[PDB]
Amino acid sequence: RVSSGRDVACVTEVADTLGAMANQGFDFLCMPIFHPRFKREFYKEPAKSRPGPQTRSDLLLSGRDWNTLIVGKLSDWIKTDSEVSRIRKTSEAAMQQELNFSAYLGLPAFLIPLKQEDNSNLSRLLINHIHVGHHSTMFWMRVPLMAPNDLRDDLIENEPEERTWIWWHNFRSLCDYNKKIALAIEIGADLPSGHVIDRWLGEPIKAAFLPTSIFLTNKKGFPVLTKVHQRLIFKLFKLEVQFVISGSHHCSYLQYLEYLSQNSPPPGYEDYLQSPLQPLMDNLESQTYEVFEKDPVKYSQYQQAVYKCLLDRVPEEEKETNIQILMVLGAGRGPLVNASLRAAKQAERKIKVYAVEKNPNAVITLEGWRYEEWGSQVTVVSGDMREWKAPEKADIIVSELLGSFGDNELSPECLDGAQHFLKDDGVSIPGEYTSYLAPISSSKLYNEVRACREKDRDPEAQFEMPYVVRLHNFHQLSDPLPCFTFHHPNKDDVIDNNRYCCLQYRVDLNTVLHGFAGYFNTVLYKDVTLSICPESHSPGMFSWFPILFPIKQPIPMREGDTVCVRFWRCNNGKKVWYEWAVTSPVCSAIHNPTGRSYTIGL
Amino acid sequence: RVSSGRDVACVTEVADTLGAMANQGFDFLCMPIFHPRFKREFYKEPAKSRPGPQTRSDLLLSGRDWNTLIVGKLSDWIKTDSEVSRIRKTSEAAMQQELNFSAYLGLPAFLIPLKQEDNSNLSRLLINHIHVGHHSTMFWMRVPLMAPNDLRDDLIENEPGEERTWIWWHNFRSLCDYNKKIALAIEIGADLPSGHVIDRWLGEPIKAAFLPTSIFLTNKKGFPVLTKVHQRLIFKLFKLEVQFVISGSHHHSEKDLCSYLQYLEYLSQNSPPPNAYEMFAKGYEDYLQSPLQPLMDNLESQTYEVFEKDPVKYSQYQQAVYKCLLDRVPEEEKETNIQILMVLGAGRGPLVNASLRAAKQAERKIKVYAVEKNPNAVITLEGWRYEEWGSQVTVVSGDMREWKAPEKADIIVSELLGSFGDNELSPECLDGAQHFLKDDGVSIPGEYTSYLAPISSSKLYNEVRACREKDRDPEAQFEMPYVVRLHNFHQLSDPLPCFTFHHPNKDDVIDNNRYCCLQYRVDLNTVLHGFAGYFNTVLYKDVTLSICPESHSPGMFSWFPILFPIKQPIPMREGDTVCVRFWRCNNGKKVWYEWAVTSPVCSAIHNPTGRSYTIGL
Ligand SMILES: Nc1ncnc2c1ncn2[C@@H]1O[C@H](CSCC[C@H](N)C(=O)O)[C@@H](O)[C@H]1O
Ligand SMILES: Nc1ncnc2c1ncn2[C@@H]1O[C@H](CSCC[C@H](N)C(=O)O)[C@@H](O)[C@H]1O
């Protein structure tokens, strides 16, 4: 509901200003804890021996107020990266002094502006302050979307976009992507391109500063922003960031912000990052199935597949004399079986149903429909499809053992064991599925994986295992290439699910390789498909999240380079895992060798 | 003694071939454990159901003979990186078969040749076999210094650069994550690459060198003789103490195989005498230790003995006192002027004696104060005191920063210099000892300056990477300096002056907190692994000591260089610039360094707040 704050240059009376901005509709206040003009000496007499208080004490406000209402502001005269040695020293002392005072008050946030590209010494002092005890203080980095020198007016006759991004990137990289360090963007009269904007939005923005001078005066003397500025506020709305109003009153600009909200264009697993589920190794929970059974697209296509499958193997003269044997391999809690029954009667054709399941907890749900809805036509079998002896061969087998990478849930291994009781002319649904790989760049997802270090194991094990991610959390560097492919029923001379391939991609830009995004598509029956590939309008695009294969050493690359990735799929009879390595432009180490970090049961 | 082996193409009778090559002078035999022509099927009948043994039994030799005399050879028909799926799948099964059997025999080493650039699938199969328990078997990767296509005779009309095979080995070892069980077995051809290329080869863990019988020239007497080009390569291999392997038929000369071994023994006893080497020998060659802290810790007597082994430091310091005396007391004050000299950090003696003899050489009278904080060293100091020196030398036990001198000094002499100059906290010690120095007093050394240079060393990096200790930050090893050697790394640019300290420091407010940005231009395509640290110092006027790379001042063998590693190695192109931010911090209780790379790629600040490395007091 639009949380807003007020940025002031100087406060003559704290108690009065707080109530004044409260009546305006502001939630918090960005104020300096030291007077912005009150410069001080630390080394040279007699200015060093200056008597009196350094600033107003902590007893002006309650502890509750300092922790909720006040956002501290660093003095602007402090320049920790000044080329002047004396000034650099003084700033270092002043930097530590104000950082320590902000933590003493228990401030929730502290503003530190970046006014140049070189903020090396600042980052050094900041991460030092964070490491030395003091905590629970978020650090908002005031960084303008455009440099002040790029927004000035062309008034100098002898001196007539990616700039400020380097300011933030270099500082954050130097600070090793510390969690206590967020971003506070400042919006100028001119905005960067749409792509650059989206890149800023990927950064942990906690506040957005709105200068009072970027607002236009309407016909009735009311503040108004351009559509260019408006679209940015719309993107900032769905990030739930706070807005800070800075500048002179010449103050209910919040009305226009609420106006832009109440009437905002319509559209939370976006941050979500965990390891892929293993239905074959683990008995899923009822709450887990419900998520899978919450997508109608998967239900529709699986119904349309069985629909067309019957129509292509039994004519009208056998419409009631031919009874097909349909087996639901991995029935789950019902939906797949009900989809077949809703497909058989849709185009009148008689079927004999066998519903198998290894999960006993799901069998109970299956045997609920068995004696309340389905009947005797649907036979319930409790066990593994690879060890169960069927007393009758099947015309059709329907299964949904597909993961984010297609075969990562060991669909091939399962269907290969259930292939023996399939008729010679039998049709398997799905018929085939293909995994895809695409080189990506995500400093966000990398540091997110980097923080997944667990004790009592390999400190780098988190980099040698796949993760289920989201599309917008990374920038795809090249179009996905087909990785592995499995088709059922497998009429190969011998069934070997061990695979290997070398995929190459062309680097068009200058970026950093952080890993590989994994997608997949499948063919249930002819014409009926399910796909999650990016550039594909095929249905099922919201049925699976993309997978991510991280890399240990991020690879900075120039444009004109090539990325060859070696990818293995291994099967030692007990476990199935993936091994991967980069061989261009530089050779990395083979990730997850012998499944030392990641394996999939059976 | 030169250990050597024999590479055979095939063996009919094993017991016969062993005794045959044993009397030739060999110490081991490089033979295949499976017949090189015995290509086998695994996935298709009727060839799949092949009866009989796959190869000869293990009962032919004892365990002792298998463990010490035999180096297994992988079959050449096994091509696990063929673009044909049927060939690859067959080779993969064949690869695992011979590997598991070689480990079953307890073989000390196993030969696997690299014949192309793409050995990705080979790496996967190899590091697997190492990880499934079977170890203790060294893996000799046979890689020729020159590609077979580059050594063939130009005999084709329609089909008429030397770092080609280096990529074969480098890509393979990198894919194998620089595994400890994987070594290099170079194969020497008729043509040799550049000397710098060779020097890069020798940096790798070479365990063996293959000497074909076809590279030997037949002398006018009929004896096998190597060319002078090859002889220099053999000489370099001698000091690496690698083993030599003779491959091919001895019927290229009029003599037998033993003559090839006698020639190598001949070159060994006629090999050039090593100097500019042997300092480190034998050796501090792979020296990777943390810098000693004589201030936070009391050195052992053995440790002092090492520092006192360099006559250069003794001479230069003696020369410094020599010149300093003559400059501050004239000839007419040859006996009426007694110079008050103080040896701050006397150690076991040397600096005190070097000052006494410098007084006799200059014919000047000095009153000596020998101060030391190490109680154990003071015991040694009071030995010289009550046997040799006398009452002219006053031995003081304590810290120079806390000691209250009852008499100001004309000259203070100290040797608190580390590999990086100030890494042993020489400034802090002298600053706290500056007060009892006269207003016109001279400090030895008068000044010193540290230097930094961007380097490349996959060798040193992986050594640091293995320095992960339990119960601490798993990346802490990359955030601390190491004392290393020059030949273990390749400098990418000339070193720049880092921090400078002069004594006595006459600044207004004495601060040892330092910061600088050093920029270097890259002229090659290489990988940044860290920064080398050197230092130079001025004892007295014109009398200096330095360990800087291209320094003409003495002291090049007085200190090993230091290394500041990096967490994420940076692959760089030529034309790129390398800006490094370097900090020296002093919080009153600890002193440490913080460094970060801001070009071409912006890294993170290493050792922030001295979380991984500090220096006492
Ligand atoms: N070998 C086997 N035998 C019997 N049932 C199996 C099996 N392997 C898997 N299953 C069943 O098949 C079901 C797979 S549910 C898979 C959901 C899918 N990955 C999605 O994201 O939508 C599970 O309920 C499991 O119990
Ligand atoms: N503050 C202090 N007070 C007194 N003695 C000190 C001191 N700091 C160091 N010393 C002494 O000075 C000696 C320095 S030995 C240094 C060896 C030199 N870095 C080299 O590698 O060649 C030590 O024996 C130590 O005991």
Q: What is the CATH code for A432-602?
A: 2.70.160.11
Distance from residue A601's CA to the centre of ligand 1 (Å): 13
What letter does residue A487 receive in the DSSP assignment? E
Contact A436, A481 (CB under 8 A): yes
* Interhelix angle A120-131/A85-105, nearest 10 degrees: 30
User: Which candidate, B226, B231, B202, B206, places its Cα nearest to that of B216?
Assistant: B226
CB B127 to CB A590 under 8 A?
A: yes
Task: Report how far residue A80's alpha carbon sits from residue A100's, in angstroms, rounded to the nearest whole number.
Answer: 16
Structure tokens, A193 = 């391109």
Name the amino acid, one letter, at A241: V
B205 burial level (CB within 10 Å; 0-12, 13-18, 19+)? middle
CB A173 to CB B608 under 8 A?
A: no
Beta bridge partners of B369: B342, B394
Q: How many helical (H) and strand (E) elements, i.e. helices and strands, does chain A have? A: 14, 26
Most A CBs within 10 Å, among B41, B130, B175, to test the A interface:
B175
Rg (CA), chain A: 31
User: Which candidate, B458, B547, B455, B461, places its Cα nearest to that of B494?
Assistant: B455
Superfamily of domain B280-446: Vaccinia Virus protein VP39 (3.40.50.150)
Alpha-carbon distance B35 to nearest alpha carbon in chain A (angstroms): 27
**A575-582 vs A562-571, strand pairing mode:** antiparallel
Alpha-carbon distance B545 to nearest alpha carbon in chain A (angstroms): 29
Q: Would you tell me how many other CB atoms lie within 10 Å of the CB of residue B296?
A: 14
**B447-456 vs B409-414, strand pairing mode:** unpaired
Contact A78, A42 (CB under 8 A): no
Q: Coil, strand or helix: which one is B613? A: coil
User: Which candidate, A208, A185, A248, places its Cα nearest to that of A9?
Assistant: A248
Task: Report how far residue A459's alpha carbon sits from residue A441's, in angstroms, rounded to the nearest whole number.
Answer: 22
B176 touches chain A (CB under 8 A): yes
Structure tokens, B370 = 């020998």
**Ligand nearest, relative to CA of residue A292:** 1
Q: Would you tell me how many other CB atoms lie within 10 Å of the CB of residue B395?
A: 22
Task: Report how far residue B129's alpha carbon sits from residue B96's, in angstroms, rounded to the nearest whole number.
Answer: 7
Task: Report how far residue A526's alpha carbon sits from residue A528's, in angstroms, rounded to the nearest whole number.
Answer: 5
Q: State which residue of chain A sits closest to B611, comparing Cα positions.
A: A131
Structure tokens, B276 = 């500019």
CB B598 to CB A459 under 8 A?
A: no
CB A174 to CB B568 under 8 A?
A: no
CB A89 to CB B132 under 8 A?
A: no
CA torsion A587→A593→A596→A599, rounded to 10°?
110
> Residues of B with CB below 8 A from A577's CB?
none
Most A CBs within 10 Å, among B118, B515, B614, to test the A interface:
B515
Check whether the bond before B504 is cis (ω within 30° of 0): yes
Which helix (DSSP H) or strand (DSSP E) does residue A126 occupy? Answer: helix A120-131
> Residues of B with CB below 8 A from A512's CB?
601
| Of the partner residues A127, A493, A589, the one whose CB lies closest to the CB of residue B608 | A127
B23 touches chain A (CB under 8 A): no
B429 within ligand 2 shell (Cβ under 6 A): yes
> Residues of A with CB below 8 A from B569's CB?
553
Rg (CA), chain B: 31
A494 burial level (CB within 10 Å; 0-12, 13-18, 19+)? exposed
Q: Would you tell me how many other CB atoms lie within 10 Å of the CB of residue B125?
A: 17
Task: Report how far residue A500's alpha carbon sits from residue A258's, in angstroms, rounded to the nearest whole number.
Answer: 56
Contact B137, B110 (CB under 8 A): yes
Residues 6+ apart with CB under 8 A from B125: B80, B92, B95, B96, B99
> Residues of A with CB below 8 A from B178's CB?
589
**B28-32 vs B4-7, strand pairing mode:** parallel
Q: Coil, strand or helix: which one is A222? A: coil
User: Which fold is adopted by the domain A268-431?
Assistant: Rossmann fold (3.40.50)
Structure tokens, B445 = 């050394």
Residues 6+ apart with CB under 8 A from B588: none
Q: What angle do CA B602, B606, B607 make, to 5 degrees?
A: 165
| H helix intervals, B181-250 | 195-201, 228-238
The count of residues in chain B is: 617
HSE of B312 in the Cβ direction (CA atoms, 13 Å)?
12
User: Which candidate, A80, A127, A73, places its Cα nearest to that of A105?
Assistant: A73
Contact B293, B332 (CB under 8 A): no
Alpha-carbon distance A131 to nearest alpha carbon in chain B (angstroms): 7
Contact A415, A400 (CB under 8 A): no
Beta bridge partners of B608: none
Contact A438, A478 (CB under 8 A): yes
User: Which candidate, B571, B614, B574, places its Cα nearest to that of B594?
Assistant: B614
Task: Report how far residue B34's alpha carbon sits from residue B97's, in angstroms, rounded to the nearest whole number.
Answer: 10
Residue B491 Cα to chain centre, angstroms: 13
Phi-psi domain of A578 (left: phi exceeds 0; alpha: psi -120 through 50; beta: other): beta
User: Which candidate, A453, A438, A409, places its Cα nearest to that of A548?
Assistant: A438
Q: Which of B429, B434, B537 to mutate to test the pocket of ligand 2 (most atoms within 8 A of CB)?
A: B429
- Is it true that A268-431 and A432-602 share their CATH fold? no
User: Which candidate, A399, A442, A118, A106, places its Cα nearest to that of A280?
Assistant: A399
Phi-psi domain of B492 (left: phi exceeds 0; alpha: psi -120 through 50; beta: other): alpha
Residues 6+ apart with CB under 8 A from A584: A504, A561, A562, A563, A564
Task: Report how far residue A40's alpha carbon sits from residue A55's, in angstroms, rounded to the nearest whole number.
Answer: 11
Structure tokens, A316 = 């009208």
Contact A302, A543 (CB under 8 A): no
Alpha-carbon distance A440 to nearest alpha carbon in chain B (angstroms): 18
Task: Report how far residue B384's alpha carbon sits from residue B353's, in angstroms, rounded to the nearest whole number.
Answer: 9
User: Which fold is adopted by the domain B447-617?
Assistant: Hnrnp arginine n-methyltransferase1 (2.70.160)
Contact B81, B119 (CB under 8 A): yes
Phi-psi domain of B114 (left: phi exceeds 0; alpha: psi -120 through 50; beta: other): beta
Contact A415, A488 (CB under 8 A): yes
Residues 6+ apart with CB under 8 A from B331: none
Q: Would you tell me how many other CB atoms lie within 10 Å of the CB of residue B612?
A: 17
Phi, psi of B319 (to 5 degrees): -70, -35
Ranges of each domain in chain B: 1-278, 280-446, 447-617
Phi-psi domain of B25 (left: phi exceeds 0; alpha: psi -120 through 50; beta: other): left
CA torsion A384→A388→A392→A398, rounded to 10°?
10
**A4-7 vs A242-246, strand pairing mode:** parallel
CB A581 to CB B120 under 8 A?
A: yes
Hunting for tokens 């060890």 — which residue is that?
A387
Contact A582, A555 (CB under 8 A): yes
Q: Catalytic positions of B, please?
A: 415, 424
Q: Coil, strand or helix: which one is A3? A: coil
Distance from residue B295's CA to the centre of ligand 2 (Å): 6
What letter does residue B35 receive in the DSSP assignment? -
The count of residues in chain A is: 602
B131 touches chain A (CB under 8 A): yes
HSE of B11 in the Cβ direction (CA atoms, 13 Å)?
23
Contact B319, B397 (CB under 8 A): no
Q: State which residue of chain A sits closest to B172, comparing Cα positions.
A: A587
Q: Coil, strand or helix: which one is A71? A: strand
Phi-psi domain of A257 (left: phi exceeds 0; alpha: psi -120 through 50; beta: other): alpha
Task: Report how far residue B480's alpha carbon sits from residue B461's, in angstroms, rounded to the nearest whole number.
Answer: 12
Residue identifier of the C-alpha nearest atom 6 of ligand 1? A330
Phi-psi domain of B381 (left: phi exceeds 0; alpha: psi -120 through 50; beta: other): alpha
Task: Report how far residue B255's alpha carbon sits from residue B250's, in angstroms, rounded to the nearest whole number.
Answer: 7
A520 burial level (CB within 10 Å; 0-12, 13-18, 19+)? buried
Alpha-carbon distance B176 to nearest alpha carbon in chain A (angstroms): 6
| H helix intervals, B289-401 | 301-307, 311-328, 350-361, 375-384
A240 marked as part of a ligand binding site: no
Phi, psi of A334 (to 5 degrees): 140, -65
Task: Report how far residue A580's alpha carbon sits from residue A344's, in angstroms, rounded to the nearest whole number.
Answer: 44
**Ligand nearest, relative to CA of residue B304:** 2
Q: What angle do CA B531, B533, B538 make, to 5 degrees?
A: 155
Show binding-site residues of B for a protein: 307, 415, 424
| H helix intervals, B9-105 | 14-22, 63-68, 85-104
Contact B431, B438 (CB under 8 A): no
Size of the A and B interface in Cβ pairs below 8 Å: 107
Which helix (DSSP H) or strand (DSSP E) does residue A327 occupy? Answer: strand A323-329
Q: Coil, strand or helix: which one is B259? A: helix
Which helix (DSSP H) or strand (DSSP E) does residue B565 occupy? Answer: strand B562-572
CA torsion B179→B185→B187→B193, rounded to 10°?
50
Residues 6+ apart with CB under 8 A from A306: A326, A339, A340, A343, A344, A396, A398, A429, A525
Which helix (DSSP H) or strand (DSSP E) does residue A85 occupy? Answer: helix A85-105
- Which 391-450 residues of chain A touch chain B by CB within 8 A? none
Burial A102-136 (b: 16+ CB within 10 A, else e): bbebbbbbbbbbbeeebbbbbbbbbbbbbeeeeee
Strands (E), A91-202: 109-113, 138-144, 181-186
Q: State which residue of chain B sits closest to A174, comparing Cα positions.
A: B604
Hunting for tokens 């190695």 — which residue is that?
B569
| Of the partner residues A173, A512, A593, the one whose CB lies closest to the CB of residue B131 | A593
Q: Coil, strand or helix: which one is A418? A: coil
Distance from residue A328's CA to the centre of ligand 1 (Å): 11
Helix, strand and coil in chain B, % to nearest 5:
30, 25, 45
A384 marked as part of a ligand binding site: yes
* Interhelix angle A335-344/A360-369, nearest 10 degrees: 30
Q: Catalytic positions of A, please?
A: 400, 409
**A528-531 vs A181-186, strand pairing mode:** unpaired
Strands (E), A94-241: 109-113, 138-144, 181-186, 205-211, 216-217, 223-224
**B514-521 vs B577-586, strand pairing mode:** antiparallel
A579 touches chain B (CB under 8 A): yes
- Which 492-521 residues of chain B touch chain A by CB within 8 A? 508-509, 511, 515, 517
A555 touches chain B (CB under 8 A): yes
Q: Would you tell me how many other CB atoms lie within 10 Å of the CB of residue B265?
A: 13
Check whether the bond before B36 is cis (ω within 30° of 0): no
Task: Report how far residue A237's alpha carbon sits from residue A5's, in angstroms, rounded to the nearest whole number.
Answer: 15
Q: What is the CATH code for A1-267?
A: 3.20.20.150
What letter does residue A367 receive in the DSSP assignment? H
Structure tokens, B540 = 């007295």
Residue identifier of the C-alpha nearest atom 20 of ligand 1? A292
Structure tokens, A59 = 């007893």
Measure Cα distances from A564 to A332, A442, B115, B526 in Å.
Answer: 39, 18, 20, 20
A48 touches chain B (CB under 8 A): no
User: Which fold is adopted by the domain B1-278?
Assistant: TIM Barrel (3.20.20)
Task: Report how far residue A109's alpha carbon sits from residue A98's, in angstroms, rounded to the nearest whole number.
Answer: 13
| H helix intervals, B132-218 | 148-151, 164-175, 195-201
> Residues of A with CB below 8 A from B114's CB?
none
Contact A576, A599 (CB under 8 A): yes
Hunting for tokens 């950093």 — which residue is that?
A512
Contact A404, A545 (CB under 8 A): yes
User: Which candidate, B38, B35, B32, B34, places its Cα nearest to that of B71?
Assistant: B32
Hunting for tokens 């003495």 — which residue is that?
B554
Hunting for tokens 């200068």 — which residue is that?
A211
DSSP string, A137-153: -EEEEEEESS-GGGTS-
B598 touches chain A (CB under 8 A): yes
B4 touches chain A (CB under 8 A): no
**Ligand nearest, relative to CA of residue B375:** 2
Structure tokens, A338 = 């009900």
Phi-psi domain of A551 (left: phi exceeds 0; alpha: psi -120 through 50; beta: other): beta
Q: Coil, strand or helix: which one is A229? A: helix
Q: How was this structure determined?
A: X-ray
Phi, psi of A122 (to 5 degrees): -65, -50
- 3-state secondary structure string, A339-359? HHHHHHCCCCCEEEEEEEECC
Q: Coil, strand or helix: which one is A547? A: strand
Hunting for tokens 């798993």 — which residue is that?
B474
Nearest ligand 1 atom, CA A402: 19
With the C-alpha atoms ordered A270, A276, A280, A283, is the resulting torsion angle positive or negative?
A: negative
Residues 6+ apart with CB under 8 A from B57: none
Task: Report how far residue B106's alpha carbon sits from residue B592's, in angstroms, rounded to the nearest whole number.
Answer: 48
Contact B358, B318 (CB under 8 A): yes
Beta bridge partners of B218: B224
Residues 6+ apart with CB under 8 A from A11: A17, A31, A32
